[PDB]
């Protein structure tokens, strides 16, 4: 056809075949063409962006520094070869010739309160603000908010934040060497908990674990640990590998296992009855350490915790108990020298002392 009309928001392209020089012409018009010119297409629509949405144009044509399209020595358009450009909202365009439209319209994406993007550099560039970005770069773009897209970064995935309820921790692990929220080195493979509540985001090499959920200490009840490593606990006490201590209520109301340590059990309370006494065997020392070989007796209105190590020689056993008619012959291996003995009588209560032997269970009357 020599006719050609163009509607208002369409375009073709022109080409000339003695200067070789394709063009763009934009309706309304009824186009007439000149003797050495091919119409290379009926008149195609504009591309219209939508407010809140984009595109992405492939082989985009170049523009100085007044936004204006360039031509070539011949009047060819000017384009960036192989690159890309980002269009949001604006007034209809054409498509210049050589311009590709790489993706069709597109929402731009809405980023809600407690999520991320989690985006990727597919290669070196410069920032926004001036800085430099490396390819296999990863980072958070942080919601809320709306993310513009950008030809050089992929978004890899939506993160979602972890809820921290009280009396829980998160446990992370480390993708790579990086420095947690706080600013704290942290190793690949490593693991913390995180224990602020609320809604935790973790960063993109922040690999996300399990809760941790508290264990509630009472006046009944001891956490035995083991150190699965040497580490510095809430309280600032340090412990080393395989060392084991408990946690009580005076320690705290509840406790986290951190990743540090390993739950052995809950120690119930042992209580002693005021006629009641008990042998420790293997009792721990002043110096924290179990004394082996050893015994303690403990007696008669006491309450406490079995320590690491430590263990019961024949469970909780009754005192004895002395009428009238009964007494107690006792030696002495210590007031009295060592070797010596004694008669005890009356009505009495006896707690063994092994510094002294009862001999003999005198019911002699």
């Known amino acids: 056809e020599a006719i050609i009309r163009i509607p208002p928001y369409h375009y073709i392209h022109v080409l000339d075949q003695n200067s070789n020089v394709s063009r763009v012409e934009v309706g309304p018009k009824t186009y007439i063409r000149q003797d050495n010119e091919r119409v290379l297409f009926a008149p195609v629509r504009m591309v219209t962006v939508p407010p809140r949405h984009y595109c992405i144009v492939a082989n985009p044509v170049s523009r100085d520094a007044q936004s204006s399209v360039l031509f070539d020595v011949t009047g060819q358009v000017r384009l960036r070869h192989a690159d890309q450009e980002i269009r949001l909202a604006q007034d209809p365009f054409p498509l210049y010739p050589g311009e590709l439209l790489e993706k069709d319209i597109t929402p731009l994406q809405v980023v809600l309160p407690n999520t ?7 290669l070196d560039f410069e920032d926004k603000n001036g800085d430099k970005v490396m390819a296999g770069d990863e980072w958070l773009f942080e919601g809320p908010g709306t993310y513009i897209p950008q030809k050089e970064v992929e978004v890899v995935e939506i993160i979602q934040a972890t809820v921290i309820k009280q009396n829980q921790a998160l446990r992370l ?33 922040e690999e996300v674990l399990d809760l941790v959920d508290a264990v509630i200490l009472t006046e009944k009840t001891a956490l035995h640990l083991r150190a699965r490593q040497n580490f510095k606990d809430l309280r600032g006490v340090a412990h080393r590998t395989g ?32 006629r009641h006494y008990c042998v420790i065997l293997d009792p721990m020392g002043p110096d924290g350490k179990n004394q082996l070989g050893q015994k303690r007796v403990v007696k008669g209105e ?43 009588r009356g009505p009495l209560e006896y707690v063994p002392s092994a510094k002294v032997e009862v001999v003999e269970e005198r019911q002699a009357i």
């Open 116 to 122: 991320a993007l989690h985006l990727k550099a597919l």
């Open 243 to 274: 060392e084991e201590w408990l946690v009580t209520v005076q320690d705290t109301e509840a406790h986290v296992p951190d990743v540090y340590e390993e739950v052995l059990g809950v120690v119930p309370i042992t209580t002693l009855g005021p």
């Open 173 to 205: 692990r480390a993708r790579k060497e990086c420095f947690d929220r706080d600013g704290k080195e942290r190793v690949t493979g490593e693991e913390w908990l995180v224990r602020s509540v609320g809604a935790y985001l973790p960063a993109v090499f």
């Open 302 to 344: 006491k309450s406490f915790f079995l320590q690491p190590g430590e263990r019961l020689e024949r469970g909780i056993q009754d005192v004895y108990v002395l009428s009238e008619q009964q007494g107690l012959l006792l030696k002495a291996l210590q007031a009295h020298q060592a070797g010596d003995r004694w008669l005890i």
